């Protein structure tokens, strides 16, 4: 009863308690960081060529900062901690903010940013740091794709004849990249491939009716 | 307590919602014939508009008596226990009702100005509401069926039209990309929204290349 | 970029990011309530019928109180709102908690608590108040069966002789009772029907195995 | 960067992976025989003394195992890795409590098996025991000892079932202190009971034909 | 003809069919809500109970069911009644099962797919109503044989030794007549799978009860 | 008892099995018809006359193979049966249907259809046309109508691409008309707007080109 | 050409299909062969000297049976219709296995089997036993002893539960000595372990009442 | 002799793991070649530049040679009956290399390549000869694959400016659904994945559409 097999199941037993609370609070806040990527991604979808481009970005920059915060807190809460042991508790908030971050940068720079280059900005110092496994990256920008079909088509919608081409090729390159891997990866990213390859087609096709149409000279009026 | 008694209760409850769900499944099936009556009236450019429109206001009367007739089918306070049993039908009304309005005023119907066209009471008046969530989604419906109808216009030489709907598409799609959406109905079918935008776009470009800048 | 249209996605962005937030809330409020429920079981089932059972089942009781406590919150999060519509977000914490509740009140009186008995217990003031959907209600008490052939099994371990045929008892009733629903019943529900079979066989089998062990005559002894 | 050198380096990474992967199922298979061979050592009775030496003996081969096991990885991504040796693990732990019981009769540390494996406590640096694989290990243990108390009363070995049921009970009581996820340490715990029922079982027949004593 | 004439033509069908359909649905649903009366009768036998009347009672309302089919014996076409093969089912597998242990508890003995039919109101294979199809009624056995292995577990914790030996008996014979057939149709075999578990259920009690000197 | 009658089950089983065999070959042999119809028609994909007269001549074989599968079953457990032709009975419908357009670019009826089959209408007896199945051979004529339109308008034929758009909306307001009930029915209806659009669009290419 | 070789490829996948029709065929009786002898020997829970024989002879038109099926395919495209007699090829190992425990109380080899199914050892030429439907014809040997176990305590026989306990004890100890890969396999001895506890419970049962 | 039986299954499992192995190692082999061969067309849709097609089919064959004697190697390693063992671990790099094969002989002739012709190039022997075989099932895959290959190789080479090519690839891929109209499919995973072709015909079609009602023969 406070037998010594008793008291080494008592520290176990706080031990886990402590283990399961953490990981309940990292949940949380993997939820609102997925939450709050989410919708910097549907802002970022607002940009038309029009003038607010500007304005837009600056805007889901400022959310971006929030989002790391969250994940500031997230680093704080895995110190002492060993990485992977948490990892089922974040990795979708990470994923999603993987999406956004690169979205963002597409949109400003037309290029793929780089793992590194998205770590980089989640060192927090008064320092703590947290590092997205090529694994969250791999999910994440194979959801960038898809958000970035969006952009083509919507695009298209408004007059752009540029951004569709730019995206296509951009995307030509992304489903190189998982063609290269292959099998090589994890079985999510496998699962990832057929959307993927969805998204390139749409996009492909895309760019193939904008040819189409703008190589025709109508030769009959109304 | 006993078990027997509160199963028996139970199976109570169970046996009433059940009454319930064939009550409003009966009034559903009926404003599914009527609506679908109404749409064939409204079609049309597929055209006397003012004509047709008017046809088709009469049979929304048809629909006022129908969902009031609803109303007492179930407990007005429990809407959203029964909800998913005419959230389609719900729907396409609301899309037939601002189709309606699209073809008279070429403006986009409100949701009071829905729900005074359908027998309902805004959402200020304790009573059958309509979800926010419905209306949208029956938005997404008429813009489909106005891309479809821009395409045909210029099948039928009135040129006019396509630029009309361009201009209404268009501001259609700026609002809904104000929307932050979760993964349901209504995200899925917002993601048609950017297609049918882009094939209005197209007729307008065909048209203006081929003698119409306007 | 303010015409009326502009303006109404405007609105609408707010009403739906605002609701959007509500469903949020209410789900980390069930997260917790539901973890806190699963800990007030995992701690009634430490009783042995040893002295220290009213300890903790007044200790259980404490559980209990905080865990209505996060569910008084949600009430607050509720009012002026729609029943049903937030529902699919704290549904599992409901259910939780009615296993919870039940599972104590089973140990207490032997008997099964009432829908209403529940609700009564969900009314807070200084006025909030929360109801159990019979859905809930059904989803929660089946999970009350797999805990109780827990305590069954359980009870038969400690050379506990009466508990077990309690229990056989019990379940006898309720299995009876989701076979009396069955098919006028949710999906959600006939799901549950089978792993109901699987908790009465074991409980109906370890009465079984009590009955003809204790009614033997060992005709051959070992000293 | 571009497109290409990102992806380069990351079929990189992934091919490093599978290497270390290949590498730490090597180590694990020859793990996997070793423990085998020690609980055939165990399972006479499936005379004890010198079986749990010889048994110890084999523990050595262990040690040097999963001290070559720790160089096929980097040390602090043991959870990158965890779940292709954790099996192995926890049925040594089972083992070495195994061998600890069948002595003094009483349930292993955690400290006590690290060191029994050649691995670090918590406090130190490096290769540790999981909580949860300490754990199952234990569960394994308690129904191996059901088991045993059946086959000792077959082999009128009398006076074990008694003791295994003390240590089985006090172990029930431990575990009932736990509040658990659901996960495989959860689907383990609950077959507790039953191998804790299996005994009491054997003690009622045992003292209804006068033992007792 | 046009399109459009051929369409509410359809439509009259499609109207007709669905009365059908709808028929069809209140009878299913009158027969589970009788169905599972005679159950929760039955059910009532574990935890020794009555026997004799219960069997007389769950007669009679083998007669309600009677009625309810034989009413529609002539309302709709032949053919029509192998249609919505995949709704009466269960009810009818069910009820297979109810009166195949209503017989049991009778006379221990199987009941015959004709004397089953007999009881339903159900039409023998030529008669044109409704029919007993072979593999519906095999499927209502095995549910017999698995309700039996728990009632000889039960059975036993009520002080009852005897009647596990007569269900040992039972069980295993139906064990060897399925070991004649050959079963294509897919649930049904997966369905016979359980009664392998069954027959090793009820040979387990027979010996627990063999080994303490009690048969 | 229980042995005799398990015995009896057995006799029956067995005969079920082989009434599957049967009717399994009867399909197979009709599937194959069917494949080489579906052939001569898709060359329209240049006289047409000829290659429906050329189909309407495989169908006498199709006649035979159902008047035989009419002998591998008692008539009146149809839809006991019914699953194992299912598919072939639909794309026979599709077939016959496909053939009628190419002649006289109108609907054939439920009743012409099981003319040109070999089977009896719903108010003789025997072999039945279910109303699904005419409707889903139906609609897959319209995805192949679609189809149809397009390869016209590449081969010179600008006419065609009209008729074809009246007439699958014509089908498309005629499905209006109905509730669907059968899920996999609803399913494949849910795409006849595809074809709609599809021969739309087609129709609209042509008109802003000047071609009418 | 494109016609031409796809011509050429539906002869071949026409022959392949006769080949599993054949395949199919001689399994199908060898499936019946395996239901009779199982009753033979399943009739045990006594004469089983008398059963054993009869088994054996039964293994005659088993014998045959696959003599036959050894001309349905050529003898190297072995694993190729394998997964056609897997489930039949196991049965048999397992009933063989069974005869010779209930003739010897010992456990049947590999080679052995496959004298009594008439088939050739892997060192020989054309059908082989392999390693994996072995070990699992021997799990299902296992499950089947434990029953007996049961039954022949019902039956009055306390001798047979010791045997075949030491003697389930020696399988479960074999396979430890083995490292599983195959899925189905590996799952099906993960049931192995619950035999052995019902018979060593059955011995105990036995002991504390004075047997041994 | 329960004991002998087991040590003696132990040994016969030990060479069967061997066998398994080696397959292992030889099946990501081919992977690794298949992922660079892939690697050397990456860039044909965008067809812009110069696009040495001729180039990359050499290098393509030149791969193939890789694989040629990576299979050539096994040809006599174990015994026959066993190259149709772990059918459902080699058959997919398998699947993939035909497509691979079938593409460069369609970017060098525009013909489809005989199931003879690949096994050759591959270094697998034909139906008869001891070693690796090359499944009609298998080949049939590794066509439709192509087939859905050259419907998006239409559109993205009219994206490019070729107007020509997508006339020929209608052509052929029309040719294969006539042919496979030919076959009765009774293999599941195979017959779906023909339920695909349908898509790529109507694809394609609809191209040489886009073109035709714009001039262009």
Known sequence: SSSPVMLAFKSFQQELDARHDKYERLVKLSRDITVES?????????????????????????????????????????????????????????QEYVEAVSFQHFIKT??????????????????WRL?????????????????????????????????????????????????FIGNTGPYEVSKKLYTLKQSLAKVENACYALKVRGSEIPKHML | ????????????????????????????????????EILTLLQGVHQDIPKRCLKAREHFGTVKTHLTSLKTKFPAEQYYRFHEHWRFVLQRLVFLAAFVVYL????????????????????????????????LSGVLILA???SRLSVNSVTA????????????????????????????????????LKYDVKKVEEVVYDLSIRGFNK
């Open chain 1, 131 to 179: 590092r997205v496994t090529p694994v969250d990256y791999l999910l994440g920008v194979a959801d960038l794709t898809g958000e970035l079909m969006r952009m083509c088509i919507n695009s298209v919608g408004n007059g752009d004849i540029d951004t569709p081409f730019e995206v296509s090729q951009f995307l030509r390159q992304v489903y190189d990249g998982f063609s």
């Open chain 1, 110 to 127: 037309r290029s793929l940013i780089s793992m590194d280059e998205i770590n980089k900005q989640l060192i927090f110092t008064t320092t």
């Open chain 2, 104 to 135: 008279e005023t070429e403006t986009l119907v409100t949701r009071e100005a829905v729900t005074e066209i359908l027998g309902i009471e805004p959402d200020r008046e304790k009573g059958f509401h309509l979800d926010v969530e419905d209306y």
């Open chain 1, 38 to 94: 989410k919708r910097t991604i549907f802002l970022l979808h607002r940009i038309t060529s029009a003038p607010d481009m500007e304005d837009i970005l600056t805007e889901s920059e400022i959310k971006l900062d929030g989002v790391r915060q969250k994940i500031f807190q997230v680093a704080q809460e895995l110190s002492g901690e060993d990485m992977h042991q948490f990892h089922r508790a974040i990795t979708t908030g990470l």
């Open chain 2, 144 to 146: 489909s069926e106005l």
């Open chain 2, 1 to 36: 307590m006993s078990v027997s008694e509160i199963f028996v209760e139970l199976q109570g409850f169970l046996a009433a919602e059940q009454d319930i769900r064939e009550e409003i499944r009966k009034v559903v099936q009926s404003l599914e014939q009527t609506a679908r």
């Open chain 2, 157 to 192: 030489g009135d040129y006019s039209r396509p630029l009309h709907i361009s201009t209404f598409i268009n501001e259609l799609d700026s609002g809904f990309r104000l929307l932050n959406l979760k993964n349901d109905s209504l995200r899925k079918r917002y993601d048609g």
